[PDB]
């Protein structure tokens, strides 16, 4: 599924990541936009190997399991196929895993080189939420 940019802000804020460990919507908005450009079925090969996977780009060698990534630890639980659902639970819940880690956002390259002190309020404004 392609969200636009207030409906994926509606489905995040429905799904509990509005201010989730001190992260407003916005950061959520802007971090999917750059990882995935809002596609739930986004799929990138890494070059350690591993495979990025949906809407937040969730990697098979720490958070899911893809059978393919040498060294998987599958920490969230679930396999990789489950992040490219156009139901956004899976990558939420591995997403909340994630930011809970100890760096933060800084877990996605994408939110620190794109998102990281912007005006990430501008991801929400004029949405219904
Ligand atoms: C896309 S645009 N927006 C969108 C479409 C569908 C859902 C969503 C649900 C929304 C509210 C609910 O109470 C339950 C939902 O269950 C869903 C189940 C599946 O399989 C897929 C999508 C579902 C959302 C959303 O999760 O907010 C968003």
């Given at each position: 599924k392609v969200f636009g940019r207030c409906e994926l802000a509606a489905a995040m804020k429905r799904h509990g990541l509005?201010?989730?460990?001190?992260?407003?919507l916005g950061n959520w908005v802007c971090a999917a936009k750059f990882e995935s450009?809002?596609?739930?079925?986004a799929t990138n090969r890494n070059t350690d190997g591993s495979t990025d996977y949906g809407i937040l780009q969730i990697?098979?060698?720490?958070?899911?399991?893809?059978?393919?990534?040498?060294?998987?630890?599958n920490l969230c639980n679930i396999?990789?196929?489950?992040?490219?659902?156009?139901?956004?639970t899976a990558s939420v819940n591995c997403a909340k895993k994630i930011v809970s880690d100890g760096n933060g956002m800084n877990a996605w390259v994408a939110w620190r080189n794109?998102?990281?002190?912007?005006?990430?309020?501008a991801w929400i404004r004029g949405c219904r939420l």
């Amino acid at each position: 599924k392609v969200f636009g940019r207030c409906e994926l802000a509606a489905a995040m804020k429905r799904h509990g990541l509005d201010n989730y460990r001190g992260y407003s919507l916005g950061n959520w908005v802007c971090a999917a936009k750059f990882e995935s450009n809002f596609n739930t079925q986004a799929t990138n090969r890494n070059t350690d190997g591993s495979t990025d996977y949906g809407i937040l780009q969730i990697n098979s060698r720490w958070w899911c399991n893809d059978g393919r990534t040498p060294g998987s630890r599958n920490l969230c639980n679930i396999p990789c196929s489950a992040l490219l659902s156009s139901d956004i639970t899976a990558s939420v819940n591995c997403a909340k895993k994630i930011v809970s880690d100890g760096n933060g956002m800084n877990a996605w390259v994408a939110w620190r080189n794109r998102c990281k002190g912007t005006d990430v309020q501008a991801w929400i404004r004029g949405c219904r939420l």
